Amino acid sequence: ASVSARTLHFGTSATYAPYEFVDADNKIVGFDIDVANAVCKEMQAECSFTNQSFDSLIPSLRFKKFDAVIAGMDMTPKREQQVSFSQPYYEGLSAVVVTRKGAYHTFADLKGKKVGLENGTTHQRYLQDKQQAITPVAYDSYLNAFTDLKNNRLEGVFGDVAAIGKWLKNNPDYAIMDERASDPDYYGKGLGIAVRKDNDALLQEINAALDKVKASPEYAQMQEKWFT
Amino acid sequence: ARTLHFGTSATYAPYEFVDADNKIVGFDIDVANAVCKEMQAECSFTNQSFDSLIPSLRFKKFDAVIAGMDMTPKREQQVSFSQPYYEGLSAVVVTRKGAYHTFADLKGKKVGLENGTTHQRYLQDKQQAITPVAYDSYLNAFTDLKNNRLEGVFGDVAAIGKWLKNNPDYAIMDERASDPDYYGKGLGIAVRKDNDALLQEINAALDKVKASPEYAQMQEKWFT
Numbered sequence A: 001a002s003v004s005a006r007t008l009h010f011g012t013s014a015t016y017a018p019y020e021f022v023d024a025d026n027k028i029v030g031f032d033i034d035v036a037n038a039v040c041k042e043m044q045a046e047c048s049f050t051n052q053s054f055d056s057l058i059p060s061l062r063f064k065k066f067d068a069v070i071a072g073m074d075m076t077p078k079r080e081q082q083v084s085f086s087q088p089y090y091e092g093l094s095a096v097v098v099t100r101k102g103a104y105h106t107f108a109d110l111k112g113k114k115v116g117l118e119n120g121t122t123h124q125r126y127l128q129d130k131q132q133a134i135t136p137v138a139y140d141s142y143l144n145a146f147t148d149l150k151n152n153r154l155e156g157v158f159g160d161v162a163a164i165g166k167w168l169k170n171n172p173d174y175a176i177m178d179e180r181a182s183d184p185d186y187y188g189k190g191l192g193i194a195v196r197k198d199n200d201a202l203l204q205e206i207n208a209a210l211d212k213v214k215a216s217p218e219y220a221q222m223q224e225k226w227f228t
Numbered sequence B: 001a002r003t004l005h006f007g008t009s010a011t012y013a014p015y016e017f018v019d020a021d022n023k024i025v026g027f028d029i030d031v032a033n034a035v036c037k038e039m040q041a042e043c044s045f046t047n048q049s050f051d052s053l054i055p056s057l058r059f060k061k062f063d064a065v066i067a068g069m070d071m072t073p074k075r076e077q078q079v080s081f082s083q084p085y086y087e088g089l090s091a092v093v094v095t096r097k098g099a100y101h102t103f104a105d106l107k108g109k110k111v112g113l114e115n116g117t118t119h120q121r122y123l124q125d126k127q128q129a130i131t132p133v134a135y136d137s138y139l140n141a142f143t144d145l146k147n148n149r150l151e152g153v154f155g156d157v158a159a160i161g162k163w164l165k166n167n168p169d170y171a172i173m174d175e176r177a178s179d180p181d182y183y184g185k186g187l188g189i190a191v192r193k194d195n196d197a198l199l200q201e202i203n204a205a206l207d208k209v210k211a212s213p214e215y216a217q218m219q220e221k222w223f224t
């Protein structure tokens, strides 16, 4: 007596092209969206997305506001204490600073300067722990961070290379800084889909679906589309 | 520190084949090597006919098998498979260009394939008016086709497509087979049923490999 296909409710933060972002007609799109839709199709489910701040996603997941989270989210040990992750669906990569082109080369060069980043991220934890001479400025959206960079309120913005690279396409006055951050205490954990801790049946359905999606020519094409 | 011994059948470009330097190469070779790297293991290959791989795996001749092998129900009774590492796709016949259009047109004719394959079982069960000619090796089947001893060779679209690139007198037949009862299961790495510790390591390795940009590049190398 069901009157619709099962619907899997995903939480995300659509501030982060090419992983997830909002297009011209206010629709959520990106690599993660294509992945989640493909997973839902394998599960014979419809997909629903809720867009909210990145730092609120794990808490809302735990509060049962949605079934799963996909948001370019590294499977860190800290997050693994709070949620259950799927198998990695994509690799965790190196973090970069974007600054005015030629203005900074290294983290040392940023001594005493303001660098914007997102609340709740690997990037925030890395800068706070390992680059204490730099002032981290927390935002609930990389979009506000970029605005503040362009208005000279910040000297840099620190995030995933794909996201920064994407932003740079429309901002040639800026450049990825030479020194990158790769510390494996912070970086290199794969991207995962998160579910609540006591939700193994759903998690294993998601894993079984990812096994299939990741073996598909379409999944190679998703990477080609979003990461080239 | 460790070696993983794979059994394969290097008769099936681009999955696995012998190149002009007498070395075994291909998509499956790259995948198995990547799996071995994640497991911090050396990679070793044994080359033998496709229909002997599973009996040999059970006999403990090697640890695993990778050979563009579909994960069929009949095989799962005999061995354990990893998660899929590539999709099982459509099967096609190659013939002299324009000579045949449908399986119906091949009535009472000889069509080559490897023994023990999905393609064999589909022909025998679904195209009984066609004579199956079972080979140990696709290489020999192709040779017979060029020598007019067969009317067609029946196999996976990538392998047939790859052979075609150097044989322009031939063509993929109009009617293709993708019957879900024989095709579409997905390719697996096979291990022995009582070797679940090894199976779990390979699955954990594949989880990482399949999440990698390198694995997308592998497909772009071998399938485009």
Ligand SMILES: NC(=[NH2+])NCCC[C@H](N)C(=O)O
Binding pocket: A012, A013, A014, A015, A016, A019, A020, A054, A071, A072, A073, A074, A118, A120, A121, A122, A123, A160
């Ligand atoms: N949708 C987003 N805003 N994602 C931000 C992710 C940043 C980084 N990859 C992390 O795991 O913390």
Ligand SMILES: NC(=[NH2+])NCCC[C@H](N)C(=O)O
Binding pocket: B008, B009, B010, B011, B012, B015, B016, B050, B067, B068, B069, B070, B114, B116, B117, B118, B119, B138, B156
């Ligand atoms: N290495 C080979 N000769 N592989 C043949 C595979 C043919 C077919 N995909 C099967 O599973 O039966």
Ligand SMILES: [Zn+2]
Binding pocket: A007, A008, A009, A066, A067
């Ligand atoms: Zn729900």
Ligand SMILES: [Zn+2]
Binding pocket: A023, A024, A025, A026, A027
């Ligand atoms: Zn749109």
Ligand SMILES: [Zn+2]
Binding pocket: A053, A055, A056, A119, A140
């Ligand atoms: Zn917040």
Ligand SMILES: [Zn+2]
Binding pocket: A087, A207, A211, B083, B203, B207
């Ligand atoms: Zn798994």
Ligand SMILES: [Zn+2]
Binding pocket: B003, B004, B005, B062, B063
């Ligand atoms: Zn061995």
Ligand SMILES: [Zn+2]
Binding pocket: B049, B051, B052, B115, B135, B136
């Ligand atoms: Zn034989």
